[PDB]
Amino acid sequence: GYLVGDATRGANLWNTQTCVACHGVDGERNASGTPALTPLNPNRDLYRHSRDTQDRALRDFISMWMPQGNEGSCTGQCAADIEAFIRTWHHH
Ligand code: HEC
Numbered sequence: 001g002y003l004v005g006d007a008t009r010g011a012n013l014w015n016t017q018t019c020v021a022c023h024g025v026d027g028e029r030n031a032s033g034t035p036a037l038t039p040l041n042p043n044r045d046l047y048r049h050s051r052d053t054q055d056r057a058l059r060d061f062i063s064m065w066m067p068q069g070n071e072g073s074c075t076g077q078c079a080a081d082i083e084a085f086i087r088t089w090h091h092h
Pocket residue numbers: 014017018019020021022023038039040041042044047048049050051061062066067068069074082
């Protein structure tokens with residue numbers, strides 16, 4: 001049925017699936033202290049990529065659209081886990 005995302009695993013996949021390169025550690029900053037190349041707002045109810053035709057759940061946005069340039073590399077449980085991780089950011 002509906003996969004259950006694990007935020008702790010998503011914190012690791014954030015790096016290994018290369019999200020960190022474009023979005024920094026937290027959608028705001030890089031480890032180096034410079035601003036992220038592309039911000040990521042972790043608090044939208046739904047996400048609509050500029051090339052999409054409808055709003056998506058965060059995990060489905062990730063499956064379809066990210067990492068940009070190699071979108072098929074994170075789907076399914078990867079996408080669920082990273083969704084869960086991103087939804088922890090407003091507790092930062
Ligand atoms: C640079 C090569 C990127 C990599 C690697 C990843 N993302 Fe990305 N992301 C990138 C761009 C240019 C954009 C904008 C897309 C558009 O609408 O044209 C995004 C957007 C996101 C968002 C939405 C952010 C928002 O504030 O609405 C999310 C949630 C997102 N990206 C997630 C994400 C994840 C989980 C990645 C690793 C699997 C990832 N991105 C990689 C550029 C790049």
